[PDB]
Amino acid sequence: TVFRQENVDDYYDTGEELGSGKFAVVKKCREKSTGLQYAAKFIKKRRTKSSRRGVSREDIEREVSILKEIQHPNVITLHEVYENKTDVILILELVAGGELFDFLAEKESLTEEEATEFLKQILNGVYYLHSLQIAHFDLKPENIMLLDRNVPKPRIKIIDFGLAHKIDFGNEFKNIFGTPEFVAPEIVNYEPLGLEADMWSIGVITYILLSGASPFLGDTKQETLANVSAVNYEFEDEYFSNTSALAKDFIRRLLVKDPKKRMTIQDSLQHPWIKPPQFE
Ligand SMILES: Nc1ncnc2c1ncn2[C@@H]1O[C@H](COP(=O)(O)OP(=O)(O)NP(=O)(O)O)[C@@H](O)[C@H]1O
């Protein structure tokens, strides 16, 4: 698919850099015709087929196609897409309250209430995506952003659809590997992947929300990956002595090696606690 080839600067004014990735730089921007603000994600294009720099057009188109499908309070939306010789520029819904990762860096540990407040929103967003057979494949606190970080119960949106795939056969068997701390054992072992990998990542996110500690993190990437494949984690009494056993049960049912035995997004919402890149 071809995108708009007018100069983006003719229609938007850019401001503060919001962040950057392996693939993109994201800048705050304001649309001239409406005064509304967006996050413009500039993704650097591959300059030759065999190149390793930039992102392949196939990968860019996949992120755009998925984003175009989404409309839900807990996920970002796509406003417009532009392109030029060097970049594809996605005009995304702006999430102005920063990453959950930075919010956590301030607070250390949350109460079970504060953790479940975030978690319910995360689960509602993932329920939406999984209902559409979209696996995110890179869920982590850096990919959850807050609309406003200065309210007692911040509202969130899931971002970063750079590894997201449609799972039309229940599993995909391609080159997909996210952040070692958060990937499921099937990613580590290069097995067919499905929606279940996100559910694992949610277990890791929950463990971190409650304790401020990462359950599989080793001193090198290979150690983290080996810990993940072996399901080498435990609830340290120093961090979890005052956490409810029901919270631990929720985590235990997500951090399961066999994807078929892992709780699904529907199971996670009915669970009693809730129910009301890889190389060095
Ligand atoms: N919609 C948004 N609103 C506000 N900030 C955002 C938004 N999207 C991305 N960012 C920031 O920009 C950073 C990079 O965006 P992201 O979509 O993660 O880029 P990427 O390079 O394609 N993937 P990765 O290497 O996994 O970060 C994020 O970690 C956020 O800090």
Q: Where are the domains of the chain?
A: 14-104, 105-277
Q: What is the CA radius of gyration of the chain?
A: 19
Query: Which atom of ligand 1 sits closest to the CA of residue 28?
Result: 4
CB-count burial class (<10 Å; 0-12, 13-18, 19+) for 265: buried
Tell me the two tokens of residue 30: 């304001």
Decide: 162 in ligand 1 pocket, CB within 6 A: yes
- One-character DSSP codes across the chain: ---B-S-GGGTEEEEEEEEE-SSEEEEEEEETTT--EEEEEEEEBPSSTT--SSB-HHHHHHHHHHHHH---TTB--EEEEEE-SSEEEEEEEP--S-BHHHHHHHHSS--HHHHHHHHHHHHHHHHHHHHTTEE-S--SGGGEEES-TTSSS--EEE---SS-EE-TTS-B-SS----TTT--HHHHTT--B-THHHHHHHHHHHHHHHHSS-SS--SSHHHHHHHHHHT-----HHHHTTS-HHHHHHHHTTS-SSGGGSPPHHHHHHSTTT------
CA 93 to ligand 1: nearest atom? 1
Contacts of residue 85, defined as CB under 8 A and 6 or more positions apart, other chains included, come to: 45
- How big is the CA angle at 25 (ends 63 and 79), to the nearest 5 degrees? 50
> Ligand 1: which of 36, 62, 159, 177 to mutate, judged by most atoms within 8 Å of the beta carbon?
159
Q: Ligand 1 pocket test: pick from 22, 26, 140 the residue with the most ligand atoms within 8 Å of its Cβ.
A: 26
Supply 210's token pair: 């409650």
Q: In what order do the strands lie in the sheet with 24-31?
A: 12-20, 24-31, 37-44, 87-93, 78-83
> What architecture is domain 105-277?
Orthogonal Bundle (1.10)
CB burial string 239-260: b at 16+ within 10 A, e below: ebeebeeebbebbebbbbeebe
Identify whether the C-beta of residue 138 lies closer than 8 Å to the C-beta of residue 88: no
Closest Cα to atom 4 of ligand 1: 95
67 lines ligand 1 (CB under 6 A): no
For ligand 1, whether the C-beta of 27 sits within 6 Å is no
Q: 146: closest CA among 129, 130, 158?
A: 158
Q: Which CATH architecture has domain 14-104?
A: 2-Layer Sandwich (3.30)
Burial environment of residue 149 by CB neighbours within 10 A (0 to 12, 13 to 18, 19 or more): middle
- Under 8 Å between Cβ of 136 and 167: no
What φ, ψ does residue 165 adopt, rounded to 5°?
A: -140, 150
Q: Evaluate: CB of 76 within 6 angstroms of ligand 1.
A: yes
- Choosing from 10, 102, 138, 237, the catalytic residue is 138
Residues 27, 40: contact at Cβ < 8 Å? yes
Catalytic site residue 148? no
Method of structure determination: X-ray
Q: Is the Cβ atom of 196 under 6 angstroms away from ligand 1?
A: no
What is the spatial distance between Cα 123 and Cα 147, in angstroms, rounded to a whole number?
17
Q: 21: CA distance to ligand 1 center in Å?
A: 6
Contact criterion met (CB below 8 Å) for 167 and 192: no
- Tell me how far the alpha carbon of residue 48 lies from the centroid of ligand 1, in angstroms: 25
Residue nearest to atom 12 of ligand 1 (CA): 19
